């Protein structure tokens, strides 16, 4: 239920775990901001479901109708290979919308971790503000929350994103486009 927060514990997880997750996210952000898309892609599991649902306007009583359900149209509904394919286009030197490339900044905060019943598997909530500046004066701000299922691993950056659901705080997309990953 995307209309309710993840079931985070009242008592927060350990300092060590909290820091590892935040540090992982800050590094992920750096990969996007410096256009190292391949290294970024490597942080996703083969089973990744990268989804950013369409959000609609209704009265609070009808809030159950806010999110276009799974299986419906969406802004993003990707798999590891579809993301790989998008990346192929992005670094081809022929993706005019992102070449010249945008100047982005992926700010991450409000990291809340929930330990699931499966050891090493976490469900994480985090707020994001992705700033994007391009061409001469084009500027956009993308704000929302990311709900991830992270797998703690012993190599790489210590984690892998097994699932990401992006709650973009917009109904109609006000930005010029959605060329940035969140």
């Amino acid at each position: 239920d995307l209309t309710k927060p993840i079931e985070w514990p009242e008592m927060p997880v350990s300092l060590e775990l909290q820091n590892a997750v935040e540090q992982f996210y800050y590094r992920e952000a750096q990969l996007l901001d410096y256009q190292n898309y391949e290294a970024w892609l490597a942080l996703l599991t083969q089973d990744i479901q990268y989804w950013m649902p369409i959000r609609t306007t209704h009265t609070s009583r009808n809030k159950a109708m806010e999110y276009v359900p799974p299986g419906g149209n969406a802004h993003f509904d990707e798999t590891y290979e579809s993301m790989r394919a998008r990346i192929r286009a992005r670094v081809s030197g022929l993706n005019w919308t992102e070449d010249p490339p945008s100047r982005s900044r992926h700010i991450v905060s409000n990291v809340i971790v929930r330990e699931t019943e499966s050891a090493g598997t976490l469900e994480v909530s985090s707020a994001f503000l992705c700033y994007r500046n391009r061409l001469e004066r084009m500027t956009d701000i993308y704000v929302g929350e990311r709900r991830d299922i992270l797998l703690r691993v012993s190599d790489g950056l210590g984690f892998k994103i097994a699932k990401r659901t992006i709650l973009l705080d917009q109904s109609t997309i006000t930005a010029n486009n959605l060329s940035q990953f969140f």
Partner: protein
Amino acid sequence: NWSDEEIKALVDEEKGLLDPRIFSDQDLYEIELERVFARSWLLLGHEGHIPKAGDYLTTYMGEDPVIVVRQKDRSIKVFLNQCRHRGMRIERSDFGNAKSFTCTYHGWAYDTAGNLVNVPYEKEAFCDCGFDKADWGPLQARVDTYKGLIFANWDTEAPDLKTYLSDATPYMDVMLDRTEAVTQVITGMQKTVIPCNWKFAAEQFCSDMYHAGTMAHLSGVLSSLPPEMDLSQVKLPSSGNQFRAKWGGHGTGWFNDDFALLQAIMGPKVVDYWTKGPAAERAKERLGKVLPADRMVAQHMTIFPTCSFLPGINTVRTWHPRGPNEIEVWSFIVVDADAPEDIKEEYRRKNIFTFNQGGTYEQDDGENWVEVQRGLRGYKARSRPLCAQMGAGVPNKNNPEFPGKTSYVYSEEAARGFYHHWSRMMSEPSWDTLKS
């Protein structure tokens, strides 16, 4: 301000010359709202958006917000989403099912037909009657459909929808009339904003295969091809045609026979369903009566002024105007109702991946329009005509096998028709001449 003669001169249909100002002039935009948007048949959505009685959708007709709602008798009514008391928005939700509509400013209530049925303190404040609720319901629009698509027009003097569509329906049928079961619309409409004039978008979907056949989507093709295949392994077919509606400015283009091109975009699963098997055969049976639809690849089409879609890819959208320098793109996906569920799912995913805002094709489309609009701030940039003469007066490019006026797939004949009809609606006050 602008005389009809000056307006008509903005477009040279014969030589193929466009005055850049038609895309930037604010005064001309105001005229468009009056002479184009207020009297054209505009796409509001699909019947599947409001299947049950009471079901409604809030959308636009130009910049006028409207409510689209299914009546108990199965008919569809469309009226201005504005309360005549002080102008408040009547329904602020995106869609749903209602038994009534209420303006929260002063409580004026309406039925699902748009009739003002309740005015708080009516007898105490409006009478002692000279006030009749029957005279104050929001403006109603004429409503009609064409094989699933819902259209509306405010002008009671305008020609009916079918007549308006001229000889363009056979081409629309390629996407909308493949089965007796009709089409369904995938749940979820995507709405996005783009800082460009609506004409650039509508024109492109009406006559511009050229951008796709050249540089615009080289990255898009790379994204949709299998990892082991690259651009050198894709032959862009030399053979395709374009249709220009006899009347109305509608247009559509396509490549002939080489479905490998459509497969490079939608994948083999979609292409096989579209070209082989019972479904494909059933479609040929229906469509072949009017045109060789079975050879049409990567078709693009626009129903003047702002209804665009891509038969085969199946993305459909309305370009809502927002002044001369901006538009909103409201898109959705249609699929054959009796198509296999896995085929419907494939269409959903491929569409999100390609022609959705954020897709590997759509983003590069807006990129050009946006840059073009920015440049129009310049005085010299607006002082000379844009070149729309491609194929103008050039013989031996038509293909009689297809109905109506046709030309090469890379052509601006349809575009010429698009802008010509635009110039006519803009310069002709009465339908007495316009319907001709």
